[PDB]
Design a protein around this ligand. Structure first.
Ligand SMILES: *CC(=O)NCC1CCN(C(=O)C2(Oc3ccc(Cl)cc3)CCOCC2)CC1
Ligand SMILES: *CC(=O)NCC1CCN(C(=O)C2(Oc3ccc(Cl)cc3)CCOCC2)CC1
Ligand SMILES: [Mg+2]
Ligand SMILES: [Mg+2]
Ligand SMILES: [Mg+2]
Ligand SMILES: [Mg+2]
Ligand SMILES: [Mg+2]
Ligand SMILES: [Mg+2]
Lengths: 5, 236, 236, 5
């Protein structure tokens, strides 16, 4: 899963 | 509102306590209460709101993924029938997740966004609007799926347009917005090239602006830049 | 009971799904529903019940400790007055914790314990009764504190007496019971010597019985024995 | 905090 903020 | 009788300042104080205690459901309820007082939020207050709901929905999303995976496995050939329970429970978690997203979007529409005139606040809330439509999109399978996706895209795009006009390329809100819009493109919009282009351009424009920053601003910006690089490494 | 319309087997199935998803509040609600069907629980089912509530209350206890610490700091000399909020929120978390403990104790009293005739089940439920009175004791400050402590002690003691008569010294329920009763002595009863004696005697009697075990039973027993040793190392 | 199960 990719990084989000 | 169960929080209607509590002072705004008390709600914010308790949200901070709930954060320390890792009680994110409580934190979110406190911040919902604070928003519903009707006053604009400060930067700190916006961050409390976002942290609270990020954690709540993040947990829901993780659970939904576990359940969806189990459900998918159940529908492979050679999988013995186990009845409706897996679907029911996935639906239950899904409905709860949708409820949290609708609550957040509700707060943004009534009336955070419309009162947000400064770039920093307006971009922050439109990013959130994009994010919570993106979470709705992750679980959408029916008639409104395209409209949910477009709602996310539209919010992110408005945020991008403001952020490009009004904020430096190193601004952490601008960076985080681009990070998440890039993920939207990769995971939701079936647009991996757009995702990669966005992450790359955002990284490079930030790199070129780091020289203008204090040590503390540098730390904040480079942290998110590393998340962009992490995604790029994942995708290439 | 919101679970009254759901099949017992469906509740158990969903409890297992909720465990995989780390949705312990749901897991606990499912298992409460299953208990309330009125049938005795199997070993597996008892473990689902215990895991669910252990996780829920464990989270509550951790939060309460964070809040209590903040509250204590607020009442030191030189601490600037911040109003009632810290106490209110600690009370809120406390009341919720007490509610979960009362729910568990309720299930045990209506009617798990009375129907439990086999040593393994009866000791398991009395250990739980001791544990949930111990959690109530951790937050008790008033008139009933001594009676709460004695309720924990009485449940643990009945469990100990049965376990000593009916189970080998390596039985994991017997070991876990002794582990927790030892902690009760150290943390609740102000009896550290009793805690140490109990942990030591339990460890040594288990050690002497390991030779009787299969490799798998050996693994289960030695794991808990290591927890006894860990506590002993902490306390000595 | 000590170990319990
Ligand atoms: C009011 C405001 O300026 N909010 C953003 C603020 C600086 C950036 N920031 C962070 O660095 C971390 O989280 C976010 C959260 C939202 C957004 Cl849009 C960007 C970044 C928190 C620390 O880890 C890195 C990201 C939040 C506070
Ligand atoms: C029905 C039954 O036999 N229940 C106990 C069973 C074996 C022991 N066991 C464990 O080894 C762990 O957890 C507990 C939980 C409760 C009690 Cl009383 C003792 C031990 C789970 C794995 O980590 C070590 C302890 C639970 C299942
Ligand atoms: Mg007021
Ligand atoms: Mg649905
Ligand atoms: Mg472009
Ligand atoms: Mg039936
Ligand atoms: Mg109280
Ligand atoms: Mg003795």
């Amino acid at each position: 899963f990719p990084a989000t903020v | 509102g169960a929080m209607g009788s509590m002072e705004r300042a008390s709600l914010i104080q308790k949200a901070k306590l709930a954060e320390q205690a890792e009680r994110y459901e409580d934190m979110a309820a406190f911040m919902k209460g604070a928003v519903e007082k009707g006053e604009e939020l400060s930067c700190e207050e916006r961050n409390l709101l976002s942290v609270a709901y990020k954690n709540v929905v993040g947990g829901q999303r993780a659970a939904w993924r576990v359940l969806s995976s189990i459900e998918q496995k159940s529908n492979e050939e050679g999988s013995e029938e186990k009845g409706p329970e897996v679907r029911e429970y996935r639906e239950k978690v899904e409905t709860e997740l949708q409820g949290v997203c609708d609550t957040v979007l509700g707060l943004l529409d009534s009336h955070l966004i419309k009162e947000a005139g400064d770039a920093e606040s307006r971009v922050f809330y439109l990013k959130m609007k994009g994010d919570y439509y993106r979470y709705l999109a992750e679980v959408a399978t029916g008639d409104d799926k395209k409209r949910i996706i477009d709602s996310a895209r539209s919010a992110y795009q408005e945020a991008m347009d403001i952020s490009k006009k009004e904020m430096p390329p190193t601004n952490p809100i601008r960076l985080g917005l681009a990070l998440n819009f890039s993920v939207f493109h990769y995971e939701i919009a079936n647009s991996p090239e757009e995702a990669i282009s966005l992450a790359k351009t955002t990284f490079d424009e930030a790199m070129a602006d780091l020289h203008t920053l204090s040590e503390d601003s540098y730390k904040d910006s480079t942290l998110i830049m590393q998340l962009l690089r992490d995604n790029l490494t994942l995708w290439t």
